[PDB]
Each structure stands twice: as C-alpha cells, then as structure tokens.
Amino acid sequence: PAVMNQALAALLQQTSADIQEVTGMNRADMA
Amino acid sequence: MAETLEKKHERIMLRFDRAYSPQKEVREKCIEATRFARVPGGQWEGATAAG
C-alpha cells in the first residue's frame, strides 16, 4: 500500500508553523 | 592663501577622500544589514545566479 515519506511530513509541519510565525504598550504588541 | 576657486576644490576632494577611506567597511555592513532586512530578495544576494 501507499506510504508517506518522513520528508513530506516534516515539510508540511515546518511550512504550517512558518506561515503562522511570519504573519504575526498594548497597541505596540499588536501587528 | 588659495586665492583661486580651483585651488580650493582639490583640497575639498582630498578631504573627501580622507573622510571616506577609514569609514568604508562599516557602512558596507550597515547597508548590507538594511538590505538583508528589507529588500525582498536581499537575503540571498551574492549567490543569486548559481547552478
């Protein structure tokens, strides 16, 4: 049966985290 | 006395060279940092065409 290589899963997780990370005294904390 | 205006200009040029010579490698780092932080493709500069 079909398999999922670990590189693809790692890339999925890393890209998902990086999208949220890059795209963002109380007012100054807001983006 | 440097009566002529031409005699006053090469002195200014020499002073410009003397002021530019020491502070040359620091401003390079400053400009590189600004470019690395703001220019969209500036983080890969120096190896843009490589293959």
Binding site: - | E25, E28, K29, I31, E32, E45, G46, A47, T48, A49, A50, G51
Partner: protein, 80 residues
C-alpha cells in the same frame, strides 16, 4: 605488470592454460601498478553555501558565497 597482463592475454594462442601461481603473481603486479596511479578526488562546495562571518567577506565582492556557479548566459537566441 605489463608482462603478466600480456602473458595472460596471449595464452590461448598456443592452446595452453594458466596456473594458480601465475594468476596470483599477475594479481599482485596489477595491484602494485594500480596503487601508484591512484588518485582520490575531493568534493568541492556547492556554490550556494554561505561563508561565515569569520572569513571577513565583503559586499564589495561575490565572496559572500562559495564560487562555481556559471551564471548569466543570457543573450540572443530567444525562447530560453
């Protein structure tokens, strides 16, 4: 080495057959010949590899990265 190789290559001309001792001698001579000319290549860096700040590179030059990229072959002959 050359003599053993030739001798092994021209035995069937006279309808004969080698012997184990001759084979061992030929193998040893061939190994000795190959040892002298052996060269082991080394792997150079890619060309998109960053050079650390400790090398004191300059924005003046392209030393910010390792060389060996062969870029910018643009010109005429379009569709590229």
């Amino acid at each position: 080495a050359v003599g053993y190789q030739l001798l092994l290559r021209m035995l069937s001309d006279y309808s004969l057959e080698p012997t184990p001792q001759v084979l061992s001698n030929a193998q040893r001579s061939y190994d000795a010949l190959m040892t002298d000319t052996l060269v082991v290549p080394s792997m150079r860096r890619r060309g998109d590899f960053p050079v650390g700040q400790g090398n004191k590179y300059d924005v003046f030059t392209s030393d910010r990265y390792y060389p060996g990229d062969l870029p910018l072959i643009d010109g005429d002959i379009p569709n590229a």
